[PDB]
Amino acid sequence: TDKRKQSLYFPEEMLKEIQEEATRQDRSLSWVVQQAWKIARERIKSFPAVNDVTG
Amino acid sequence: TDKRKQSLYFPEEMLKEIQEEATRQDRSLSWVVQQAWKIARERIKSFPAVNDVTG
Amino acid sequence: DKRKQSLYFPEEMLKEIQEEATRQDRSLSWVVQQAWKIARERIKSFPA
Amino acid sequence: DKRKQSLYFPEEMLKEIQEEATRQDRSLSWVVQQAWKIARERIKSFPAVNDVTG
C-alpha cells in the first residue's frame, strides 16, 4: 500500500471531470481516482472474462 | 475526448488489482480505470463539498 | 489458457508496441498476440 | 537498447513461438520481434476501433 506512480491516459472531458471533483473536495487527482476504484472494484471483478469461453 | 496522459499514484495492492483486471479482459490499465470512473462518477459528483458550509 | 513470458525489446520497438496498444485501448500482450497471428506464415516459411 | 517486458500468451501460441525459435536456433524474443516487424504496418493502418475519427 506504499504509493506507486503510474501514467494513465484519459479523454480530455473525463480528465477535466476528475480534476473538478478533486478541486471540489480540496483533494489530489489520485485520491478521486482511488475512491472511484473502491466504488467500481466489485462490478468490474464480477464481470466475466469477455474473451475466455469459461470467463 | 482526444487522449491525455496523466501520472497518478496508487497503493501497490490497488495498482496490482487494476493490472490483474486489465489483463483478465486483454485490456489497457487506462481502460479499466476509465470504466471505474463511469461506474463511480455519479456517487462522487453527488457527494457534497466536505469542507464548504453550503457543499 | 494464458501463460506469462518475459521477452526483450529495443526501447524504440517497445514504445511502438505500447502506442499501438494505447490506440486500441488494449494490453501489450494483445497487440503482440495479433502480430503473431499476422506474421505466423512468413516466420514458419523463412529458412532453418 | 533492449528492455525486458512480461507478456501473456495462450499456451498453444507460446508453444508455437517456442518451436519456431528452436527451428531457427533463435531466441523467443527474436521471433516475436520479427513478427512485430512483419505485422507493424497492418496493425498501424487498421483504424482506432473505438474512436469515431479512427
Author numbering:
A (entry chain C), B (entry chain C): 4 to 58
C (entry chain B): 5 to 52
D (entry chain A): 5 to 58
Publication text:
Consistently, c-di-GMP and DNA binding are mutually exclusive. CdbA is abundant and binds globally to the M. xanthus chromosome. These observations are in agreement with a model whereby CdbA is a ligand-regulated nucleoid-associated protein (NAP) important for chromosome organization and segregation and in which CdbA activity is modulated by c-di-GMP.
Successful model building of the first form allowed us to solve the second form via molecular replacement. This form has three copies of the protein in the asymmetric unit, one of which forms a tetramer via crystallographic symmetry (four copies of same chain) and two of which form a dimer within the asymmetric unit, which then tetramerizes over the final crystallographic axis. The tetramer centers on residue F50 of the two innermost chains, and the C-terminal tails can be traced five residues further than in form one, and with the C-terminal tail of the innermost chains in a dimer contacting an opposing dimer. Protein–protein contacts mediated by the tail region include a hydrophobic component from F50 and V53 in one chain projecting towards a pocket in the opposing dimer formed by W34/I42/I47, a second hydrophobic interaction between V56 and P14/M17, and a more polar interface between the free carbonyl groups of A52/V53/D55 and the side chains of Q38 and K41. The arrangement of the two dimers in the tetramer places their β-sheets ~35 Å apart (measured between Cα atoms of equivalent Y12 residues). Because the β-sheets are ~35 Å apart in CdbA, this model suggests that CdbA bends DNA upon binding. The tetramer interface displays different hydrophobic packing between the two crystal forms we observed here, suggesting that it may have inherent plasticity that allows it to undergo this change.
